[PDB]
Amino acid sequence: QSACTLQSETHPPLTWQKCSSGGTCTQQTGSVVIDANWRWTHATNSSTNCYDGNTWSSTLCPDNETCAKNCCLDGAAYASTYGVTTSGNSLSIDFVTQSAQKNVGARLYLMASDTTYQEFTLLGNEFSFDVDVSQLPCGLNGALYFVSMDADGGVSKYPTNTAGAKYGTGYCDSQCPRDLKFINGQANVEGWEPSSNNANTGIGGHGSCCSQMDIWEANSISEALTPHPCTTVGQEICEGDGCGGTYSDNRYGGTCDPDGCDWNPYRLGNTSFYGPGSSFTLDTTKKLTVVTQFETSGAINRYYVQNGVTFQQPNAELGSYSGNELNDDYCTAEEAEFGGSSFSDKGGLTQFKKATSGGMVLVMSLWDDYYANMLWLDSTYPTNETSSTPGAVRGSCSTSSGVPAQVESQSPNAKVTFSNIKFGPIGSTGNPSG
Ligand SMILES: OC[C@H]1O[C@@H](O[C@H]2[C@H](O)[C@@H](O)[C@H](O[C@H]3[C@H](O)[C@@H](O)[C@H](O[C@H]4[C@H](O)[C@@H](O)[C@H](O)O[C@@H]4CO)O[C@@H]3CO)O[C@@H]2CO)[C@H](O)[C@@H](O)[C@@H]1O
Numbered sequence: 001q002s003a004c005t006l007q008s009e010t011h012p013p014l015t016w017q018k019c020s021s022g023g024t025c026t027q028q029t030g031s032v033v034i035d036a037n038w039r040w041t042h043a044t045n046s047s048t049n050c051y052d053g054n055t056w057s058s059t060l061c062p063d064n065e066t067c068a069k070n071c072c073l074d075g076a077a078y079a080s081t082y083g084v085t086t087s088g089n090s091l092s093i094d095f096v097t098q099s100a101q102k103n104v105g106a107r108l109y110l111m112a113s114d115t116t117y118q119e120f121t122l123l124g125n126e127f128s129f130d131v132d133v134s135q136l137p138c139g140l141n142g143a144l145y146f147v148s149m150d151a152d153g154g155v156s157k158y159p160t161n162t163a164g165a166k167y168g169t170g171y172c173d174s175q176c177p178r179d180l181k182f183i184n185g186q187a188n189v190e191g192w193e194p195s196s197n198n199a200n201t202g203i204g205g206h207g208s209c210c211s212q213m214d215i216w217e218a219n220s221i222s223e224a225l226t227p228h229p230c231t232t233v234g235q236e237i238c239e240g241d242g243c244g245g246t247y248s249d250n251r252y253g254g255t256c257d258p259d260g261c262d263w264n265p266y267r268l269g270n271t272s273f274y275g276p277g278s279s280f281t282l283d284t285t286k287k288l289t290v291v292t293q294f295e296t297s298g299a300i301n302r303y304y305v306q307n308g309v310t311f312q313q314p315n316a317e318l319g320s321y322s323g324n325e326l327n328d329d330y331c332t333a334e335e336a337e338f339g340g341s342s343f344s345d346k347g348g349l350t351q352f353k354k355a356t357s358g359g360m361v362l363v364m365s366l367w368d369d370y371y372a373n374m375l376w377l378d379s380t381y382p383t384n385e386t387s388s389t390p391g392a393v394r395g396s397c398s399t400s401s402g403v404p405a406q407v408e409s410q411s412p413n414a415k416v417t418f419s420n421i422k423f424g425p426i427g428s429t430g431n432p433s434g
Pocket residue numbers: 037038039040041047049051052053081100101102103104105106200201
């Protein structure tokens with residue numbers, strides 16, 4: 001796709017701290033850009049939509065190539081249309097924003113410049129951020145994570161994409177998303193099947209795969225940390241069901257692990273660590289600091305801070321595994337206890353290390369789940385299982401919670417606020433900000 005300018009594109013600024021092993025941190029100034037899927041896609045020479053509701057223009061878009069040639073992405077009114085605002089080192093995303101149309105959440109990328117994404121090399125470093133999940137009930141997810149996307153959003157590899165990072169193109173993740181309207185400079189109209197429950201979405205014949213470091217998938221009820229490996233580290237197109245993931249009938253596709261080696265304290269047995277109010281170690285009605293460290297061995301460590309009090313990731317005993325570090329032994333023990341082989345089949349932490357050794361783009365979003373109602377995160381899943389089934393219970397939400405239409409109607413004013421992002425060598429982000 002190309003870019004049009006009927007609506008100006010002004011990325012909301014966002015500062016973050018870059019810290020050094022020497023004990024100091026200096027401010028960095030970037031901004032955030034919304035993913036292409038949320039934008040208006042119209043004919044290059046008029047205001048005629050190329051995509052409207054959940055269907056493509058059969059005339060402007062008879063095939064993937066003709067569509068990309070005829071269509072462009074336009075600018076976004078961040079606040080009024082998408083409920084996205086920033087203030088210094090803070091970013092807030094509203095759940096439901098009503099303007100000419102209804103919008104649900106957003107997926108944003110941290111940019112280095114107005115035309116490029118900021119890349120982060122995680123291995124040997126740590127990522128810290130503050131988050132207020134107090135306004136996120138069951139069924140919602142204010143996610144913060146990393147994906148192996150190209151800094152230009154795909155422009156150099158696919159000439160037919162001239163919109164680039166400035167218009168949020170180039171997305172990929174471990175689900176090998178087939179819901180994307182443009183992948184590799186081409187539309188995804190061929191094979192498009194509209195969603196039966198979502199008026200704005202569908203699933204195309206192609207998907208976009210890549211490694212994903214799911215640092216934070218959470219709401220006020222549950223939270224998870226999950227690395228997802230892929231046989232090919234960076235962004236790569238996939239065909240139909242071979243894509244696997246949430247959008248295909250067979251989730252175990254040929255390149256990415258859609259499950260991951262997840263770590264949810266509640267799922268592991270500690271039901272008193274994270275939740276709303278004073279009866280939990282971490283009170284989700286108040287802001288908290290989340291720190292994730294990526295040691296060179298390939299293992300992942302984590303600690304939290306609230307009201308100045310520090311808490312390492314709680315210990316978990318699973319099979320022969322015991323501890324609080326997300327390592328090979330943990331992931332192997334989890335598959336043995338909870339079942340599955342997806343993570344190890346895709347190479348595990350060794351394969352995942354190949355992604356953290358290279359650059360990854362920061363993603364911040366707010367979304368509800370049209371495929372599983374966020375049950376895999378905050379409830380019992382599958383819903384027919386009981387607490388006796390190892391790993392079934394991941395949170396205290398009812399198995400009837402999270403229906404998109406219901407949560408959007410009942411909690412339209414829900415929101416998530418990410419702030420004070422700090423990145424640097426392990427042991428440095430706790431030092432004074434510049
Ligand atoms: O039609 C001419 C008219 O266009 C106006 O611009 C509209 C676009 O017409 C309309 O297609 C566009 O719709 C967006 C919508 O705002 C987003 O909320 C929505 O986001 C979805 C996304 O589609 C999904 O892929 C994702 O999973 O979830 C998100 C969140 O729900 O995406 C649709 C497009 O698919 O909105 C534009 C702004 O109102 C012009 O403003 C007007 O001048 C023209 O006359």
